[PDB]
Design a binder for this molecule. Sequence first.
Ligand SMILES: OC[C@@H](O)[C@@H](O)[C@H](O)[C@@H](O)CO
Ligand SMILES: OC[C@@H](O)[C@@H](O)[C@H](O)[C@@H](O)CO
Lengths: 420, 420
Amino acid sequence: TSEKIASLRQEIETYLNTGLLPFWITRTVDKENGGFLTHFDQFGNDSGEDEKSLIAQSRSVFTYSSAHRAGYGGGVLAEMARHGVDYLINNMWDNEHGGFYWMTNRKGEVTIDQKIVYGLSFCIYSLSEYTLATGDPRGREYAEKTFDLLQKYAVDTHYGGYFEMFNRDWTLKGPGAAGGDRKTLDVHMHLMEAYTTLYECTGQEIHRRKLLETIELLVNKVMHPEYGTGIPQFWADWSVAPQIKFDIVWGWARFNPDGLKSAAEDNTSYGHNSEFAWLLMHALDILGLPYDTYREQITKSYTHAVENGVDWEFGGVYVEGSHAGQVYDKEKEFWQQAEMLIGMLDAYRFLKDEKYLQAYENIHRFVFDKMINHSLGEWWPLMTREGVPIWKHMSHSWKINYHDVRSMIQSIVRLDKIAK
Amino acid sequence: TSEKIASLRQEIETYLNTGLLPFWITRTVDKENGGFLTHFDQFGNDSGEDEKSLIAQSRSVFTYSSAHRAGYGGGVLAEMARHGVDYLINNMWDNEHGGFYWMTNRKGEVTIDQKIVYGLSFCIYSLSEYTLATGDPRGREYAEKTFDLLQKYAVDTHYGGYFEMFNRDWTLKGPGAAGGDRKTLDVHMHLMEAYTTLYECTGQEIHRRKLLETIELLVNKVMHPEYGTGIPQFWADWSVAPQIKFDIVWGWARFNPDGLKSAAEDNTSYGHNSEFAWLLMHALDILGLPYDTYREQITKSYTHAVENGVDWEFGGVYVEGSHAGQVYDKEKEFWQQAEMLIGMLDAYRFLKDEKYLQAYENIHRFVFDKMINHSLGEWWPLMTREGVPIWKHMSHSWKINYHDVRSMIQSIVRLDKIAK
Ligand SMILES: OC[C@@H](O)[C@@H](O)[C@H](O)[C@@H](O)CO
Ligand SMILES: OC[C@@H](O)[C@@H](O)[C@H](O)[C@@H](O)CO
């Protein structure tokens, strides 16, 4: 219903303009040391972490670049992005070996000099988006510099794909938790997301060809060969590896005590599969290719998410479950809802089955009625199945505004497409 | 027999010092335009080709660098290499897009601006060898620059391996004869040869890891999965492609009218398989790895060459034949004899079966009694099975001194190893 679509779009528009973006605009710009402040407790007050992670600073650069480019933030977001791009190049860029450092403290000193491809993907993503929004060639320059370093040091020229964790001097890290012997869905999915904006910015044949190569890797090696769902970790030879926690992390380790099959290695994340599918669709948009170029893959990702991840009774998407169709972890974490909002919409656009629009409204209602802490404007990071926050910290080094702002803008955009 | 080994080594030493190297030292240095002259007819006189191919100039740089490093040329070869490195950077290097151009005319003007990975491999090979011989960091610098450009533009991050032919702006060339849709044994074998000297020069972890990735590609995708013999051409997905002639070439197209199974697509080159095997062994030497790291592969290459390629009656190695064991083309071309000299020696070192030393003496005797034009010092390019030159041009844009000088130095070296 156009009245229902308009109601949903307005709910997002008011919340995005008066709640979410103001939460960050009034808090994050650090004029003393440069960069952004991203550590806020359940009362919007500083938690005091002496960290400015590459993930935090780059995602902020992306959010403010993309939101300004979309027409949000009252025009002040572009200069906020430049403030962060200033911090990235001046404090986080390695002037002897290249690439962006993983971690800095509050005053700008490098504290983890490793070159993590997961963070470097977000550098390529955010700096490409930054140049697209502001025209500053510094974004594209350092994004191209990062891409070239990934080709030189990270690309496995035999098996394909990328090695994902390196020391500061770009030497491959050790095996196991050091991160030097695994190829992961986490990194390879976001490089596809990164190369999409990179190619959109530069327009080179090389960036279009490597974006397609990244899509091919995900479809042919990363996703389940039968179910099409994302498998988290692989060996270099692309056989499935046992899932491990790397020494370098970019999230809080959450164990659901009442989760099912704790040791099961066949888990897949509905939020990841939805995030991959709509990002692949957006990649096809940027590539000028039709969606059904990967109709089998896109249909597998969305069908699996809507049939197993959507909590129809309480609302929101579950954390993870088996490829076969069993739900393992029924908790409610913030980023999977964000990615499910966009995906379920794009699923409705491509597959045209109304259970996807129902799936969107289920998750839309969950985020606005349960997840959004309206007194501050940010999202609760983790919740019991029926709502009710488990963790109440509003933001940290790994939870900023990348997922929620983009999912808000992209949802108004796709909902507008559906109404027409 | 040590008396037989000494006799063979001395035959090479006298010929290398008094015949082959003097042929080039007295002819090739072009002080007017820079670079090297490589076009000489059957009387050692200029043929007048208005060409200075990247293959010609780079191979010359390698020959003079490697021979000087080995202690040959009366000490004058190092400065000859620098004269060529001067020409490569000043006349053949693309200062806007990077990489070395494919073709220049006699006076140094670029005539084919394409970036051909086959030539760029020889740039990495020769410039790495040049720095190892002279200490001039320009070789290593531009060799590393070329390697990095290959990772950025040439590496297929999905299927692995390299795309092999690009326009000047590094955009992938068209399909078919343009060379943009095939991965070939020719390029991938020599990159392994190039990355070996590159890693020997720089010592970086990245060059060691990519050299191993190159070896893995050749063993697992390029060689026959059963016979282990080299298959010339593949599609990007590494399935076997029909053999074609590219618009860019680096040799004379020779059709043997009395060759067997002219249309057979199962041909393999004994010279190539031997060249790959001893170069792989040398790569293992540089990598500090034992030969039996690829014992199955190395044994397949050498056994196939000695059992099918060695002409026991007349001497020398045939041109090509089937993987299964049938000889197709019994003519005698220069570069396959050179590579068979080194390979048959290394085969004797690793496999210790005396049929390989017999194979070496068969080819040694053929080259010195039939192929070497002793009145000038260079090798006849092509011959009937029983000797007797078919083509008598001594050198051109694709036949210089890369194969024969290296095979002469490396043969004295391995023969010296056998005697001890
Ligand atoms: O796609 C990767 C995933 O979205 C992860 O990067 C989360 O953003 C992070 O766990 C937030 O804490
Ligand atoms: O290994 C490739 C082969 O050796 C080729 O490059 C010859 O050197 C060329 O055909 C000489 O004309």
